[PDB]
Design a binder for this molecule. Structure first.
Ligand SMILES: Nc1ncnc2c1ncn2[C@@H]1O[C@H](COP(=O)(O)O)[C@@H](O)[C@H]1O
Length: 205
């Protein structure tokens, strides 16, 4: 199905987003055609769950489901925090460029959160999740954003463009928030997606 909403973990570590800005700029100074493929300043996030919310009532149900999700996250994390190290560059078949999530224990925890989120939302009546295996990633560019590239002289991201960063430590993000975001509504003034609702993770209540 085609989703229109998603749960999003914003990247709150300014070092990570600043380092990705450098990476995007390094790429653009080599080929300015890639400008419209870059994700916008302020939009950096990890997608946790996609879904359809197709009317105002369903948007309100989604907000309720996210509120319900909060305690499950802290159960999964066992009263500690989830540290996400962002290191190196990966792609999905040269069409989407992302900063990779380093391997480690936090990957299984993040996967458990995604699966519990899917279950939580489905039990509230929301079509959510994907059949495809969840592959967490922090996108910096996607060719699909720039449909004239395909039609023109650029059909994949040349790996030479990001070679200097292929193995760069961007930084570590501690999970602090999950937002319910609209894919299609206008972005906030700070460049982030329209947010219906948000919960805090990892803080004293
Ligand atoms: N497991 C996957 N395999 C291939 N492409 C993916 C996968 N997960 C996400 N994508 C694509 O990566 C693009 C950017 O991801 P995102 O920044 O999370 O929206 C999305 O349009 C997804 O369709």
């Amino acid at each position: 199905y085609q989703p229109n909403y998603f749960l999003s973990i914003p990247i709150t570590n300014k070092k990570i987003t600043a380092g990705i800005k450098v990476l995007q700029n390094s790429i653009l100074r080599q080929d300015n055609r890639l400008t419209k493929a870059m994700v916008g300043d302020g939009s950096f996030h990890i997608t946790l769950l996609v879904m359809q919310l197709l009317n105002e009532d369903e948007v309100n149900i989604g907000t309720d489901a996210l509120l319900e999700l909060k305690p499950f996250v802290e159960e999964i994390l066992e009263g500690k925090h989830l540290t996400l190290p962002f290191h190196g560059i990966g792609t999905f078949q040269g069409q989407v460029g992302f900063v990779k999530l380093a391997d480690g224990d936090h990957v299984s925890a993040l996967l458990e959160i995604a699966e519990t989120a899917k279950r939580t939302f489905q039990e509230k009546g929301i079509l959510a999740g994907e059949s495809r295996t969840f592959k967490p990633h922090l996108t910096f560019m996607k060719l699909s954003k720039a449909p004239m590239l395909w039609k023109k002289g650029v059909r994949k991201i040349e790996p030479g463009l990001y070679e200097q960063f292929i193995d760069h430590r961007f930084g570590e993000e501690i999970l602090y928030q999950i937002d319910l975001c609209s894919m299609l509504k206008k972005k906030q003034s700070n460049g982030y997606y329209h947010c219906e609702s948000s919960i805090v993770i990892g803080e004293k209540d």
